[PDB]
Amino acid sequence: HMSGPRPVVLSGPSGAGKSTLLKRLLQEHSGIFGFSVSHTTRNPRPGEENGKDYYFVTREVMQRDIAAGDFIEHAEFSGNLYGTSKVAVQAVQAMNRICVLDVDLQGVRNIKATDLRPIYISVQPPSLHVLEQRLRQRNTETEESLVKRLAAAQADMESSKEPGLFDVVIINDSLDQAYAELKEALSEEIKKAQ
Numbered sequence: 001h002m003s004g005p006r007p008v009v010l011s012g013p014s015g016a017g018k019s020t021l022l023k024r025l026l027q028e029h030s031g032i033f034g035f036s037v038s039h040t041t042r043n044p045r046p047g048e049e050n051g052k053d054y055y056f057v058t059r060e061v062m063q064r065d066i067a068a069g070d071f072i073e074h075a076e077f078s079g080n081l082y083g084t085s086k087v088a089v090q091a092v093q094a095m096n097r098i099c100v101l102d103v104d105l106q107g108v109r110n111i112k113a114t115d116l117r118p119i120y121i122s123v124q125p126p127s128l129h130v131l132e133q134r135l136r137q138r139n140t141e142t143e144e145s146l147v148k149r150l151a152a153a154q155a156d157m158e159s160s161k162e163p164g165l166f167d168v169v170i171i172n173d174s175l176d177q178a179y180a181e182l183k184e185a186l187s188e189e190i191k192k193a194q
C-alpha cells in the first residue's frame, strides 16, 4: 500500500533513545502518527506489552508467517528474529496516519529496497560508553547478547555518517533536546497532517 502519508523509519542503536523518543511522539501526536508493531522472537522485558511494543512470538510461529509471505522485511539481530509484517504497516496507513517504524541498520537497508519511500532518522548515543552504561542499568541481556549488541551498536554508529543513508542524525544527550529535533525533522509532515 502506497496510499496514506509518507512513513518514517527510526534507527540507531537500541537503547540510545529511538524507542523512548517514539513513545513520546505517539503520546503528543496520537492523531497524526501510528507505530508499526514488529514481530520478534526475543523474550519480553518487564513493562513491555504484546501488541504494543512487539508481537512476541516463537521462531516456529514467525517462520510460518515468513513462509506465507506475510513480512515486508526481517532481520536476525543478537540471536533473535525481528520483522515488519505487512499488516503492521497497513493498519496505520488505513487510519490515514504517518507510520513510524523502529528498526536496526539491516532493516534500514531492507526498507531502502522497498517502495515505501520514508524519511530516515538515526538516533545516536553521545558515545558507546554512555550507551553501555544505560544498557547495563536495566540489564535485560546475557553477557553474550550484550557483546553482540555492543558490536552492532558500533557498526550502527559508523554507518550513521554514510552519505545519503539518513535524512537526519540526532545525538541524544538530552531527551528533551533530541525530541525537539525529532519533531524538527518531521515538522513539515506534522503541519501538513494538521
Ligand SMILES: Nc1nc2c(ncn2[C@@H]2O[C@H](COP(=O)(O)O)[C@@H](O)[C@H]2O)c(=O)[nH]1
Residues within 6 Å of the ligand: 011, 012, 013, 014, 015, 038, 039, 042, 073, 074, 075, 077, 082, 083, 084, 102, 103, 104, 105, 106, 107, 108, 110
Ligand atoms: N530489521 C528490523 N529490526 C527491528 C525490528 N523491530 C525491532 N528491530 C530492531 O532490533 C534491534 C533490537 O531491538 P531490541 O531487542 O533492543 O528491542 C533494534 O535496533 C530494533 O530497532 C524490525 O521489525 N525489523
